[PDB]
Amino acid sequence: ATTSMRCDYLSPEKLSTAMFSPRTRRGLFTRVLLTGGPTKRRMTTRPAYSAPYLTFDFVGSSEAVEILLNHAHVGVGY
RNA sequence: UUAUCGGCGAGACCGGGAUGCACCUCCCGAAGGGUCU
CA of A7, C1' of B4: distance in angstroms: 17
The candidate with the shortest Cα–Cα distance to A41, out of A50, A49, A32, is A32
Method underlying the structure: cryo-EM
The candidate with the shortest Cα–Cα distance to A37, out of A5, A3, A4, A10, is A10
**Residue A54 dihedral angles phi and psi, to the nearest 5°:** -120, 150
Residues lying close to strand B (Cβ under 7 A), chosen from 34-73 of chain A, are 41-42, 44
The contacts of residue A31 (CB under 8 Å, 6+ apart) are A15, A22
Query: Are residues A7 and A45 in contact, defined by beta-carbon separation less than 8 angstroms?
Result: no
| Spatial distance between the Cα atoms of A18 and A30, rounded to a whole number of angstroms | 15
| Spatial distance between the Cα atoms of A5 and A13, rounded to a whole number of angstroms | 22
Query: Are residues A51 and A76 in contact, defined by beta-carbon separation less than 8 angstroms?
Result: no
CA of A71, C1' of B7: distance in angstroms: 25
- Asked if residue A77 keeps its beta carbon closer than 7 A to nucleic acid strand B, the reply is yes
Q: SS3 of A63, please?
A: helix
